[PDB]
Design an enzyme around this catalytic site. Structure first.
Site, mmCIF file in Angstrom:
data_model
loop_
_atom_site.group_PDB
_atom_site.id
_atom_site.type_symbol
_atom_site.label_atom_id
_atom_site.label_comp_id
_atom_site.label_asym_id
_atom_site.label_seq_id
_atom_site.Cartn_x
_atom_site.Cartn_y
_atom_site.Cartn_z
ATOM 1 N N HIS A 61 0.616 -1.190 0.078
ATOM 2 C CA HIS A 61 0.066 0.132 -0.047
ATOM 3 C C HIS A 61 0.919 1.566 -0.036
ATOM 4 O O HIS A 61 0.254 2.360 -0.662
ATOM 5 C CB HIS A 61 -0.925 0.004 1.345
ATOM 6 C CG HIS A 61 -1.545 -1.454 1.418
ATOM 7 N ND1 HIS A 61 -2.766 -1.400 0.489
ATOM 8 C CD2 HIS A 61 -1.364 -2.529 1.944
ATOM 9 C CE1 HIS A 61 -3.126 -2.821 0.998
ATOM 10 N NE2 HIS A 61 -2.209 -3.339 1.671
ATOM 11 N N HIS A 91 5.748 7.126 6.552
ATOM 12 C CA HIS A 91 4.947 6.706 5.246
ATOM 13 C C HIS A 91 4.829 8.019 4.468
ATOM 14 O O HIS A 91 4.326 8.859 4.910
ATOM 15 C CB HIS A 91 4.256 5.570 5.300
ATOM 16 C CG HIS A 91 2.928 6.219 5.550
ATOM 17 N ND1 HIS A 91 2.554 6.048 7.242
ATOM 18 C CD2 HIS A 91 1.845 6.565 5.140
ATOM 19 C CE1 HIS A 91 1.279 6.538 7.490
ATOM 20 N NE2 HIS A 91 0.684 6.996 6.119
ATOM 21 N N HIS A 93 2.087 9.012 0.965
ATOM 22 C CA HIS A 93 0.936 9.012 0.120
ATOM 23 C C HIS A 93 1.363 9.909 -1.002
ATOM 24 O O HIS A 93 1.501 11.121 -0.766
ATOM 25 C CB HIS A 93 -0.556 9.307 0.703
ATOM 26 C CG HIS A 93 -0.768 8.630 1.874
ATOM 27 N ND1 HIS A 93 -1.659 7.447 2.162
ATOM 28 C CD2 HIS A 93 -0.394 8.925 3.161
ATOM 29 C CE1 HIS A 93 -1.620 7.265 3.458
ATOM 30 N NE2 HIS A 93 -0.994 8.002 4.275
ATOM 31 N N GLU A 103 -3.673 13.636 0.856
ATOM 32 C CA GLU A 103 -4.744 13.034 1.772
ATOM 33 C C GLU A 103 -5.513 14.374 2.172
ATOM 34 O O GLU A 103 -6.623 14.618 1.698
ATOM 35 C CB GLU A 103 -4.470 12.198 2.607
ATOM 36 C CG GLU A 103 -3.880 10.997 1.951
ATOM 37 C CD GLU A 103 -3.717 9.524 2.767
ATOM 38 O OE1 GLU A 103 -3.555 9.369 3.923
ATOM 39 O OE2 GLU A 103 -4.530 8.596 2.400
ATOM 40 N N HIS A 116 3.323 11.294 6.499
ATOM 41 C CA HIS A 116 2.998 10.859 7.693
ATOM 42 C C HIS A 116 3.718 10.402 8.757
ATOM 43 O O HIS A 116 4.436 8.987 8.457
ATOM 44 C CB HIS A 116 1.599 9.883 7.610
ATOM 45 C CG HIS A 116 0.507 10.545 6.996
ATOM 46 N ND1 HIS A 116 -0.504 9.834 6.265
ATOM 47 C CD2 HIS A 116 0.130 11.885 6.811
ATOM 48 C CE1 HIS A 116 -1.643 10.711 6.041
ATOM 49 N NE2 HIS A 116 -1.198 12.053 6.171
ATOM 50 N N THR A 195 -5.901 6.718 7.818
ATOM 51 C CA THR A 195 -6.383 6.907 6.362
ATOM 52 C C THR A 195 -6.460 5.797 5.766
ATOM 53 O O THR A 195 -6.850 5.675 4.542
ATOM 54 C CB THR A 195 -5.573 8.165 5.784
ATOM 55 O OG1 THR A 195 -4.275 7.942 5.715
ATOM 56 C CG2 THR A 195 -5.771 9.426 6.522
ATOM 57 N N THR A 196 -5.960 4.678 6.283
ATOM 58 C CA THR A 196 -5.984 3.592 5.666
ATOM 59 C C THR A 196 -6.753 2.467 6.852
ATOM 60 O O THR A 196 -6.896 2.653 7.825
ATOM 61 C CB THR A 196 -4.681 2.720 5.578
ATOM 62 O OG1 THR A 196 -3.896 3.127 6.844
ATOM 63 C CG2 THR A 196 -3.880 3.697 4.444
HETATM 64 O O1 LIG Z 1 -1.433 4.831 6.395
HETATM 65 C C1 LIG Z 1 -1.626 5.344 7.381
HETATM 66 N N1 LIG Z 1 -1.697 6.615 7.532
HETATM 67 S S1 LIG Z 1 -1.679 7.376 9.072
HETATM 68 O O2 LIG Z 1 -0.800 8.416 9.270
HETATM 69 O O3 LIG Z 1 -3.325 7.881 9.056
HETATM 70 C C2 LIG Z 1 -1.600 5.790 9.630
HETATM 71 C C3 LIG Z 1 -1.136 5.624 11.207
HETATM 72 C C4 LIG Z 1 -1.138 4.312 11.545
HETATM 73 C C5 LIG Z 1 -0.914 3.157 10.599
HETATM 74 C C6 LIG Z 1 -1.129 3.590 9.084
HETATM 75 C C7 LIG Z 1 -1.467 4.866 8.686
HETATM 76 ZN ZN LIG Z 2 -0.588 7.650 6.004
#
Ligand SMILES: O=C1NS(=O)(=O)c2ccccc21
Ligand SMILES: [Zn+2]
Ligand SMILES: O=C1NS(=O)(=O)c2ccccc21
Ligand SMILES: [Hg+2]
Length: 256
Positions: A61, A91, A93, A103, A116, A195-196
């Site tokens: 993802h 990570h 997006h 996002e 994030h 958000t996932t």
């Molecule tokens: O993909 C995600 N975006 S987020 O920062 O909301 C988050 C928090 C924890 C685990 C996964 C993720």
């Molecule tokens: Zn995220």
């Protein structure tokens, strides 16, 4: 099964994860004119001096840079936060085009990507328990725009080659997340979710106002990653962002 495709994307997630239609989902659009400056907010404190990165993983993802969170090293505190939150991973997006990828939006503006930085509240002992609490997580969101290159991002970019497909990982020690931050720590904050999937409503969102600049070349290498596993047909890892969700009964506060 969940993904970002036509058949498994954000419009489908509510079926397995009914909280998708919940009361405090992320992301959201940030209406800068409606956000209110909050004098009650204390200074934000990002202390990543002793961060210990360990590994980078393609999870089908996004890619996660993981940290050793076995003790007090990279922690976020202050601002709207009560207590200390420990960095576990970061990570991104991003989009298939520079015109989309983030996002959160600002006055409906979409950035090319969004970083994030995920932290969990140390009062709950670990991540897992953290995600069972309304205040278990704090995420520091930073926008990426395309322009000049971000030198602190380039080690991330150059290892992506090695984690092209789902399930691949590579050693990733001694990476300094401070090189991903912008000068300013002005932010907007609101209560929200992951958000996932599973989209758990445990997050205090801290969205930096000032975007970081990244080069076309660096983001282009992001778009070379794969959603699929090795030996499977290529599905480029792009547009892995969820669109903005109803603000509902929430207020966004400004630290500035
Ligand atoms: O993909 C995600 N975006 S987020 O920062 O909301 C988050 C928090 C924890 C685990 C996964 C993720
Ligand atoms: Zn995220
Ligand atoms: O996120 C995804 N997971 S998937 O490989 O099924 C896929 C195919 C096409 C676009 C997005 C996605
Ligand atoms: Hg929660």
């Amino acid at each position: 099964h969940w993904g970002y495709g036509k058949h498994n994307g954000p419009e489908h997630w509510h079926k397995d994860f009914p909280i998708a239609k919940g009361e405090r989902q992320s992301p959201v659009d940030i209406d800068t004119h409606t956000a209110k400056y909050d004098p009650s907010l204390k200074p934000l404190s990002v202390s990543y001096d002793q961060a210990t990165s360990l590994r980078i993983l393609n999870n089908g993802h996004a890619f996660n840079v993981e940290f050793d969170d076995s003790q007090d090293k990279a922690v976020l505190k202050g601002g709207p936060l009560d207590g200390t939150y420990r960095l576990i991973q970061f990570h991104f997006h991003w989009g298939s085009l520079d015109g989309q990828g983030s996002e959160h939006t600002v006055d409906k503006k979409k950035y090319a990507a969004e970083l994030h930085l995920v932290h969990w509240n140390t009062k709950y002992g670990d991540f897992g328990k953290a995600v069972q609490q309304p205040d278990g997580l704090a995420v520091l969101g930073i926008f990426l725009k395309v322009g000049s290159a971000k030198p602190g991002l380039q080690k991330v970019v150059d290892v992506l080659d090695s984690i092209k497909t789902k399930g691949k990982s590579a050693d990733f020690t001694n990476f300094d997340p401070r090189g991903l931050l912008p000068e300013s720590l002005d932010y907007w904050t609101y209560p929200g979710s992951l958000t996932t999937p599973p989209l758990l409503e445990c997050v205090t969102w801290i969205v930096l106002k000032e975007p970081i600049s990244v080069s076309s070349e660096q983001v282009l290498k992001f778009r070379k990653l794969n959603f699929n596993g090795e030996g499977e047909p290529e599905e480029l890892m792009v547009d892995n962002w969820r669109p903005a969700q109803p603000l509902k009964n929430r207020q966004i506060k400004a630290s500035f």
